[PDB]
């Protein structure tokens, strides 16, 4: 599909968001993680915004 | 007959009203049945036999489960039915007490590993 | 239409030799006990 | 004939680099949404060439058919690449590249091929604003 | 014929075993409703979708009773 | 053509209409006056213009045939001046007013075979035929023309004759009542030609009031029906108040002095004597018909009285034709085109073999 | 008259290019079929019964629009009663379904591969239609280029 | 025609009514390649 | 009312197109004027199909 690029277009949108979420956060616990997930939901592309909006529903439980 | 008038017959069966007295419920019916005129999962008639067992033990009505164990044999013995999954799954879906969890119990085969 | 026909009563005159569904089909009536037409 | 078909490739890659560059945090909320509405149109270019490949594998493609297929979508890419070079050249971000979009939407009123393109991109870009 | 009655007998027996299965779960449905629900699934239909209307209509025959 | 063309001759009360089926408009229109000395074989305008040594005589004057010798004469002048066609190559459909009697029908076929020599024929009821032109074959029809009036209920493709109500109202009564009111209100007038002209004025220009009360109050405050008419000869006729009393006589029939029911009473009694089980089926298409559409304002009073008539549990569904002046002619022309209508069409052979009375049986 | 509107029905459905004898025969055809039915449930329920088969065949928003219009036309009864009787004998991108790149706080469902595959079929029907035109343009003309001469032209009849 | 309708569609001093005229010409020229393709397959 | 019966004429068009009826705008206007008299529409459904058959009989 041009070597399957149709299915691999919505991939590298979750993975690229978590490229920074899984590098910035290492050993964090407490509110410094809730301050480490408060600038990665601030994006204009609603994909990453809704993905980190889904992570933040978990962490603020 | 045809399915669309058959659903109207269902709407006149459960409601006491006739078909020229209600049209919003038939509109809601064409909304919900529509694009779901077939099972969205794969059939597992064995598991839905096991779910009536798992239900009747859960109620501790354990004698009627062993009665169902013979009625299911009668189902196989006659064999006028090629959709034994649909009605029995539906009967289990409409479950009412003669008088917990299923989030860990297994569900029907969803076809998320196959292009539908 | 099919379910409407379904609501009927099925016959007796069961047979021993039918094990696969013996409702009834009359194992040859008696000669006198069909009278008023057999008579003439 | 290959020369005549070549402009859409140069009007593809320049578009694709701009999508990566102006979607990160340092170019602001509007540039992300602009690039997120251009990536949708990149996707359909991939869509078309895959079906043309399926026809080609069955011994059913020539250069004439392919050229005739690609003529409408070359115009889209031309408009998109002109917008992307305009956004980059002025160092535009925020409302300076909604002024540009406001102007470009008014510019095309004899087309409806390029007007709907820019208008969809303006509707997408004014949502963060 | 005889095979034209044997089939109509052969589905009555199954419908009554199904009716026994229907009454030992003691769903509030009866034979006339059951005659629709059997006919719908021979043409194919999603049981999760028919359960939705029936679970709506049984609580709608009490707000309009 | 591929079969011989049907012909229609419509013997109407005011005028005779002949022509060929295959057209919607008639081929020739003559007056029905037959000149008889006080020419000597000519039926039409020349007899009417030579009416100073010819006495007056009409073959159809009531709305039905009340002079048979005279009808054979207009039938003979129809064959020679209006047609001069080969008669054995033309089956003819005649049309008379609603419900032809059997003996009238026997006399009709008896002279139709000798004066004309038809190969096959048809004789027809009028109001059903007019309904067939309005696009239905069930309904109740108030047919009031220049001849006789009937409120005919018809269901099952042929009229129900037990509730058919014959009502004495005609253009004859109209011209006589016009003479009565025009000489009664005070004016010097006895002549026949202005009587025809003022009758045309009442037919076209005069207003049929929607109700009595509203138009009474409008004219009583300041007469708004007033209109002047300026002829080529210089006729001057005016007042609104005389124009308001002229068609007033059908709202309440005892206004003239006649005894027969008005429009609302006849249509109510006709729809009452027709069965309840088909009443609402009949009322879903009730029709307006008749020559009185020369001014389209009698239809308004009709549909107001029909919506006042029936209960509010089934509302009015009245079909008001945007033309019904040529209604009887178009009835014939639409009817004779059909292939199934040919099976009720009687030949000359049966008329010779079982007497003339079978034309009552096969054609009815 | 009402029988005159039936002549205008014959006028619209037959254009002009003889053409004075066909229209009276078609007028006969218009009259002869009307009276055979006359010798021998609500209105919007049938609309729902026809929206159902749409939803069975996919194509959701069309059924959602058909139900949208009769809901506001009840918020002319005899003319839709004609359309349900004339049904099925006449002549007949979007980036918010399987593109999750646009929206505001787009729904989270993981990914897609099972409607994105029927997003190529949406174009595949067009690609299969615009090749059937060129199959039916090469055929109509190879029916002219190959024949015995003058059997498609009446010039041999001159 | 191929040269002219491309040059005046990047010319803006030819006006925005001229770009619309050129837009019509573009739709017509695409139908000419349908003809050339049907000819091309038969070669 | 003249405002309303132009808008209802326009909405009446779409449900005649999506129901796949043979009607276009002109025949829709003829049929809405014909039903306004009071004719039963189930009868009109047959004469329209018979016209469309006998039209093809000529060509």
Swiss-Prot record, chain C:
**Which portion of the entire protein is included?**
282 to 321 of 1819
Organism whose genome encodes this protein: Homo sapiens (Human)
Family, similarity comment: Belongs to the TUBGCP family.
Q: Where in the cell is it found?
A: Cytoplasm, Cytoskeleton, Microtubule organizing center, Centrosome
Q: What are the leading ranks of the lineage? A: Eukaryota, Metazoa, Chordata, Craniata, Vertebrata
Name the associated disease, please. Microcephaly and chorioretinopathy, autosomal recessive, 1: A syndrome characterized by microcephaly, cognitive impairment, underdeveloped retina and choroid, and epilepsy in some patients. The more anterior parts of the retina, near the periphery and pars plana, have a grayish hue and diminutive vasculature similar to retinopathy of prematurity. Visual impairment becomes evident during the first year of life.
Give the multimer and partner information: Component of the gamma-tubulin ring complex (gTuRC) consisting of TUBGCP2, TUBGCP3, TUBGCP4, TUBGCP5 and TUBGCP6 and gamma-tubulin TUBG1 or TUBG2. TUBGCP2, TUBGCP3, TUBGCP4, TUBGCP5 and TUBGCP6 assemble in a 5:5:2:1:1 stoichiometry; each is associated with a gamma-tubulin, thereby arranging 14 gamma-tubulins in a helical manner. Gamma-tubulin at the first position is blocked by TUBGCP3 at the last position, allowing 13 protafilaments to grow into a microtubule.
Protein known as: Gamma-tubulin complex component 6
Swiss-Prot record, chain D:
List the cysteine pairs that form cystine: none
Locations listed in the record = Cytoplasm, Cytoskeleton, Microtubule organizing center, Centrosome
Q: In which tissues is it expressed?
A: Ubiquitously expressed.
State the source organism's domain of life.
Answer: Eukaryota
Coiled coil ranges (UniProt) are none
Associated clinical condition: Cortical dysplasia, complex, with other brain malformations 15: An autosomal recessive disorder characterized by global developmental delay, variably impaired intellectual development, speech delay, facial dysmorphism, microcephaly, and varying degrees of cortical malformations including pachygyria, thin corpus callosum and subcortical band heterotopia. Most patients have generalized seizures.
| Role summary | Component of the gamma-tubulin ring complex (gTuRC) which mediates microtubule nucleation. The gTuRC regulates the minus-end nucleation of alpha-beta tubulin heterodimers that grow into microtubule protafilaments, a critical step in centrosome duplication and spindle formation. Plays a role in neuronal migration.
Protein family (similarity comment): Belongs to the TUBGCP family.
Q: What is this protein called?
A: Gamma-tubulin complex component 2
Where the shown chain sits in the full protein?
Answer: 259 to 387 of 902
UniProtKB/Swiss-Prot annotation, chain G:
Where does the signal peptide begin and end? Answer: none
* Regions annotated as coiled coil: none
Family to which the UniProt record says this protein belongs: Belongs to the TUBGCP family.
User: What is its quaternary makeup?
Assistant: Component of the gamma-tubulin ring complex (gTuRC) consisting of TUBGCP2, TUBGCP3, TUBGCP4, TUBGCP5 and TUBGCP6 and gamma-tubulin TUBG1 or TUBG2. TUBGCP2, TUBGCP3, TUBGCP4, TUBGCP5 and TUBGCP6 assemble in a 5:5:2:1:1 stoichiometry; each is associated with a gamma-tubulin, thereby arranging 14 gamma-tubulins in a helical manner. Gamma-tubulin at the first position is blocked by TUBGCP3 at the last position, allowing 13 protafilaments to grow into a microtubule.
Spell out the subcellular localization from the entry: Cytoplasm, Cytoskeleton, Microtubule organizing center, Centrosome
The organism encoding this protein is Homo sapiens
The name of this protein is Gamma-tubulin complex component 6
Specify the superkingdom: Eukaryota
As for what it does, the entry says: Component of the gamma-tubulin ring complex (gTuRC) which mediates microtubule nucleation. The gTuRC regulates the minus-end nucleation of alpha-beta tubulin heterodimers that grow into microtubule protafilaments, a critical step in centrosome duplication and spindle formation.
UniProtKB/Swiss-Prot annotation, chain H:
Covalent S-S links between cysteines: none
Judging by the UniProt lineage, the source's domain of life is Eukaryota
Kindly state the tissue distribution recorded for this protein: Ubiquitously expressed.
Localisation per UniProt entry = Cytoplasm, Cytoskeleton, Microtubule organizing center, Centrosome
* Function noted in UniProt: Component of the gamma-tubulin ring complex (gTuRC) which mediates microtubule nucleation. The gTuRC regulates the minus-end nucleation of alpha-beta tubulin heterodimers that grow into microtubule protafilaments, a critical step in centrosome duplication and spindle formation.
UniProt lists the family membership as follows:
Belongs to the TUBGCP family.
Complexes and interactors: Component of the gamma-tubulin ring complex (gTuRC) consisting of TUBGCP2, TUBGCP3, TUBGCP4, TUBGCP5 and TUBGCP6 and gamma-tubulin TUBG1 or TUBG2. TUBGCP2, TUBGCP3, TUBGCP4, TUBGCP5 and TUBGCP6 assemble in a 5:5:2:1:1 stoichiometry; each is associated with a gamma-tubulin, thereby arranging 14 gamma-tubulins in a helical manner. Gamma-tubulin at the first position is blocked by TUBGCP3 at the last position, allowing 13 protafilaments to grow into a microtubule.
- What protein am I looking at? Gamma-tubulin complex component 3
Species of provenance = Homo sapiens (Human)
The lineage is: Eukaryota, Metazoa, Chordata, Craniata, Vertebrata
Gene name of this polypeptide: TUBGCP3
